Design a protein around this ligand. Structure first.
Ligand SMILES: [Cu+2]
Length: 139
């Protein structure tokens, strides 16, 4: 059976901020931008590994996040409404009040991955917009 997961986006955090999948699990994931501000803001959902931050040669208290080195969804065939196939550099960007639902089979990419939002030059990320995705071997 397909396992339904929802990730809600708020300013500036995911609910839930942890998720666990098994390799080979059939997942339907809904990403919902529930931005609570007036006006609501856009949010991004990207799963990857190895944070990349801005550099200018000067030390920082908090590094400004810019992206992931490795995208979890690389090569992963996705179905969303009438469309099926892998998506190059997959990520989900939503305006306030918009959601996106897609399904896939969890690839053989075991271990810890992270999800994050890199919008507004890393400000969402610095404010809490990051989660942890654990991928367990097939049960
Ligand atoms: Cu965001």
């Amino acid at each position: 059976g397909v396992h339904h997961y929802t990730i809600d986006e708020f300013n500036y955090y995911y609910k839930p901020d942890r998720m666990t999948w098994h390799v080979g699990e059939k997942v339907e994931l809904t990403i919902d931008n529930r931005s609570q501000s007036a006006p609501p803001i856009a949010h991004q959902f990207s799963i990857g590994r190895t944070l990349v931050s801005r550099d200018n040669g000067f030390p920082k208290s908090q590094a400004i996040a810019v992206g992931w080195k490795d995208n979890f969804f690389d090569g992963v065939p996705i179905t969303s409404g009438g469309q099926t196939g892998p998506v190059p550099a997959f990520s989900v960007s939503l305006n306030g009040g918009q959601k996106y639902t897609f399904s896939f089979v969890v690839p053989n990419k075991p271990g810890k991955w992270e999800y994050g939002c890199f919008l507004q030059t890393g400000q969402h990320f610095m404010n809490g917009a990051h989660g942890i995705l654990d991928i367990l071997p097939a049960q």
